[PDB]
């Protein structure tokens, strides 16, 4: 509704202009329907959700960032194969400048944080931020995300099948023991969910506008929330899975193929509920 949107926009403005900043009202707003509504609003709100300040604009990239980055060839390759992330209406020139900044953001964060290891798909998170909030803020926000919500993904000692994936099955079991037991016998594992988690579902929801609204939700929530969103998608598809061919090839095949037009607002609700009933 348009009356509701006007009220939500004024409530966001009231929260930004309060003392103290009413961050609690901003999480509520990010969690509730439509999330934060616009990128202009997100440029102000996302840094509050991650508790990052207007700060020393990241001690500049040193000179020769690219020349000293061992991951430059990998990052260049990943970024070049990411054109689909950009509005099809976006002029070629404008897009190629954003690709240049996307490379520099990733490389700068890696250089500032040598304990972090690049992974394929990281650029799907970084480009979303660059498109929403621009290059300086994308850098300081993603850096905060990289050292917290994404750290295990960027840790090569960390075994991603342990850790984050290890939550998915008990979650599904808590809510639907049949589906749990079914997927157990298919020996399907949890690897199917992994691409979703490390790219924050950029290839699960088609509409870029839906993806950014999901980032509102993830930024407002505890860092394990994406696993509950994965769980809720799997549970949504229960019938389709219970009608499957029961093996690691069938089960994988179906779940990996994402339905068009998922009810994201409903699934976002359900992920918050599930989070409450089976917390980390
Ligand atoms: F050009 Be792909 F590496 F098909």
Q: What angle do CA 201, 280, 241 make, to 5 degrees?
A: 50
How many whole angstroms from 121 Cα to the centroid of ligand 1? 16
Solving technique? X-ray
Q: Domain 1-146, CATH 1.10.8.1310 — does that match?
A: yes
CA distance 171 to 160: 17
Tell me how far the alpha carbon of residue 224 lies from the centroid of ligand 1, in angstroms: 33
Distance 33 CA to ligand 1 centre (A): 38
- Can you spell out the DSSP letters for 57-125? --S---TTHHHH-TTHHHHHHHHHTTGGGS-TTS-HHHHHHHHHHHHHHHHHHHHH-TT----TTHHHH
Resolution for this PDB entry, in angstroms: 2.2
Distance 197 CA to ligand 1 centre (A): 23
Cα 53 to middle of ligand 1, angstroms: 41
Residue 196 C-alpha to ligand 1 middle, in angstroms?
21
Whole-angstrom Cα distance, residue 218 to residue 79? 24
d(CA 255, CA 145): 27
Length of the chain: 280
CA atoms of 186 and 190, how far apart (whole Å):
11
Residue range(s) in the chain whose domain bears CATH number 1.10.472.80 = 147-280
d(CA 8, CA 124): 29
Distance CA 29, CA 229 (A): 18
How far is ligand 1, taken at its centre, from the CA of residue 142, in Å? 28
**Rounded distance between C-alpha atoms, residue 166 and residue 63, angstroms:** 42
Which token pair is 1?
């509704």
Q: Report CA(81)–ligand 1 centroid distance (Å).
A: 9
Q: CB-based contacts of 246: which residues, under 8 Å, 6+ apart?
A: 182, 185, 186
Instruction: Provide the terminal-to-terminal Cα distance of the chain, rounded to the nearest Å.
Output: 35
Beta carbons of 145 and 133 less than 8 angstroms apart: no
To 5 degrees, how large is the angle CA 25–CA 26–CA 30? 120
CATH 2.40.50.140 is held by the domain 147-280: no
Give start and end residues of each alpha helix (H) in the chain.
2-16, 23-31, 39-49, 65-68, 72-80, 92-112, 122-133, 135-147, 168-175, 177-185, 191-198, 208-220, 225-236, 238-242, 250-256, 264-277
Q: What's the CA-to-centroid distance between 245 and ligand 1, angstroms?
A: 30
75 alpha carbon – ligand 1 mean position (Å): 16
Residues of the chain with CATH 1.10.8.1310: 1-146
C-alpha of residue 120 to centroid of ligand 1, in Å: 15
């Amino acid at each position: 509704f348009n009356a509701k949107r006007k009220k939500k926009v004024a409530e966001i403005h009231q929260a930004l202009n309060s003392d103290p900043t009413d961050v609690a009202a901003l999480r509520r707003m990010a969690i509730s329907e439509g999330g934060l509504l616009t990128d202009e609003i997100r440029r102000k709100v996302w840094p509050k959700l991650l508790n990052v300040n207007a700060n020393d604009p990241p001690p500049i990239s040193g000179k020769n960032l690219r020349q000293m980055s061992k991951d430059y060839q990998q990052v260049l390759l990943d970024v070049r194969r990411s054109l689909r992330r950009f509005p099809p209406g976006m002029p070629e020139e404008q897009r190629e400048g954003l690709q240049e900044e996307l490379i520099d953001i990733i490389l700068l964060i890696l250089e500032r944080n040598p304990q972090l290891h690049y992974y394929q798909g990281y650029h799907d998170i970084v480009v979303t931020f660059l498109l929403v909030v621009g290059e300086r803020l994308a850098t300081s926000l993603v850096e905060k995300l990289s050292t917290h919500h994404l750290r295990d993904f960027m840790d090569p000692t960390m075994d991603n099948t342990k850790h984050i994936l290890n939550y998915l099955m008990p979650i599904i079991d808590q809510v639907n023991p049949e589906l749990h037991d079914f997927m157990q016998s298919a020996e399907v594992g949890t690897i199917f969910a992994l691409s979703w988690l490390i790219t924050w579902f950029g290839h699960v929801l088609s509409d870029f506008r839906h993806v950014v609204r999901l980032y509102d939700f993830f930024l407002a929530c505890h860092p394990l929330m994406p696993i509950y969103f994965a769980a809720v998608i799997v549970l949504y598809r229960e019938q389709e899975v219970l009608d499957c061919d029961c093996d690691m090839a069938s089960v994988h095949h179906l779940l990996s193929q994402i339905p068009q037009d998922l009810p994201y607002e409903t699934l976002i609700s359900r992920a918050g509920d599930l989070f409450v009933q089976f917390p980390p």
